[PDB]
Design a protein around this ligand. Structure first.
Ligand SMILES: Nc1nc(=O)c2ncn([C@@H]3O[C@H](COP(=O)(O)OP(=O)(O)OC[C@H]4OC[C@H](O)[C@@H]4O)[C@@H](O)[C@H]3O)c2[nH]1
Ligand SMILES: Nc1nc(=O)c2ncn([C@@H]3O[C@H](COP(=O)(O)OP(=O)(O)OC[C@H]4OC[C@H](O)[C@@H]4O)[C@@H](O)[C@H]3O)c2[nH]1
Lengths: 251, 251
């Protein structure tokens, strides 16, 4: 795995771009400036073995970078990156982690520590299947935890109901590990959107299988629950990429 | 209008973000430094009255920032910003100006010259509706000229076929003034997509009115031509935002 070149300049430029021009009437600005956020992010991993991290490593960075999130708008997603982010629509309909400042800054980036100067590796990072899980998930797991902990009102969760190999809800996804269990009593309701991919066998349904497990967990955390499969607004987005599909037939 | 804050920092950050991380497998990198782009850009408007620009002003910036564009994937749009960009899909289906380095760096920014130090106005810029035509259009007009100049193969032009106040095709739009005249013999075909917004009345149709004007122009420059109104992939995208529209009735 190749680390991102010029990591600090990419971080600092995305940061400033965001601060001044991104999600302006959608998410609040952070108090800390871009240089103070870099200091917190860099110290989490710098000057240490690339596997020497834990879930507390970026704690100071996420405290500085966390934004209050708009009630009823927070979305989580598993196995449907593209469909969830198309539907959420750059913050216009829902917020995803990828719209928040830290999620926007680090999305797709690749970085790791080293002990020798300059304290990070610009040549290679290890396959993180090689590091303990708490190190491998130190950044995105704490991102998901801090994100979910800030959610208020109804939350939305979009899942894949057509994957034979991967249940729609599973406790070991980032959602199952970091998000569902970290929703606070300021959350009222979990609304599940199940994707039934076009022209494919339906593997999971509302009220059965892992959606029923998920329903039970939601009610045990004392929230309301509802679930829908291909609501129309979402079906039309699917149809846009596959217009000849049977499900998309008009009048 | 209020100008963008920290224009240099925004421009440089967006520049560096793009360079390293954006459109990597879709559009080539430019040879120039972010600092060398900023100098060409700033000198175009700095230390001048705000309305003192013409088509020529930004010439060096656009010569530096110009990327070779993927054959057949170049899209133009008039009056349908949001729908054209949703369908083009961040470069996956088509390229728009806003996906290229200069379009990305300046998209939605506001800036203007002044003559006293620091050479730009950080308080107020005129609605350039106060400036002469060639000064209003100095930047985006020269952007559109240079973009159109680099297209090869088929190009696609999406227009609004439902605006009673503005014809689908206009010789004085950016497309008629800056894009169409600059298509080279490397271009083989102009493919028009007419949008008919849902539950609104139909104003323009292929083969008639201003689209007929456009068809004759295109063929006289020796390009093939075709035209379609709400092709299904675009329709489904319109329906996803208004699923109750009668045009969206499912089988
Ligand atoms: N957005 C992102 N960019 C990256 O560069 C990255 N690298 C690792 N990850 C992690 O890999 C995960 C994708 O694995 P899935 O099976 O499709 O589904 P879940 O496992 O439930 O992830 C989705 C949840 O976390 C985010 C969001 O809030 C959502 O609810 C990323 O989420 C992220 O934590 C990343 N996530
Ligand atoms: N901020 C901003 N960013 C942009 O990327 C941009 N692109 C155009 N404009 C301005 O938005 C205004 C809207 O004018 P219209 O009737 O919707 O369409 P046309 O006049 O045909 O301009 C659109 C074509 O040129 C650009 C692109 O390649 C597209 O093909 C225009 O005065 C244009 O100068 C822009 N303004």
């Amino acid at each position: 795995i190749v680390p991102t070149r010029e990591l600090e300049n990419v971080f600092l430029g995305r940061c400033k771009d965001y601060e001044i021009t991104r999600y302006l009437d959608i998410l609040p600005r952070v108090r800390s400036d871009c240089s103070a956020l870099w200091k917190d992010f860099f110290k989490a991993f710098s000057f240490k073995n690339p596997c020497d991290l834990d879930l507390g490593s970026y704690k100071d960075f996420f405290t500085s970078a966390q934004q209050q999130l708009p009630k009823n708008k927070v979305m989580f997603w598993s196995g449907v990156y593209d469909e969830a982010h198309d539907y959420a629509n750059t913050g216009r309909k829902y917020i995803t982690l990828e719209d928040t400042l830290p999620g926007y800054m680090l999305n797709s980036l690749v970085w790791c520590g080293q002990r020798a100067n300059p304290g990070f590796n610009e040549k290679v990072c290890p396959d993180f299947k090689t590091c303990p899980v708490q190190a491998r998930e130190s950044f995105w797991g704490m991102a998901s935890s801090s994100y979910a902990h800030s959610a208020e009102g109804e939350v939305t969760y979009m899942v894949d109901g057509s994957n034979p190999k991967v249940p729609a809800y599973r406790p070991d996804s980032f959602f199952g590990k970091y998000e569902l269990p970290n929703l606070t009593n300021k959350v009222t309701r979990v609304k599940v959107i199940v994707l039934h991919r076009l022209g494919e066998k339906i593997i999971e349904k509302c009220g059965a299988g892992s959606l029923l497990d998920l329903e039970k967990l939601v009610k045990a955390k004392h929230f309301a629950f509802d679930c829908v499969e291909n609501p129309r607004a979402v079906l039309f987005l699917l149809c846009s990429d596959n217009p000849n599909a049977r499900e998309c037939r008009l009048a």
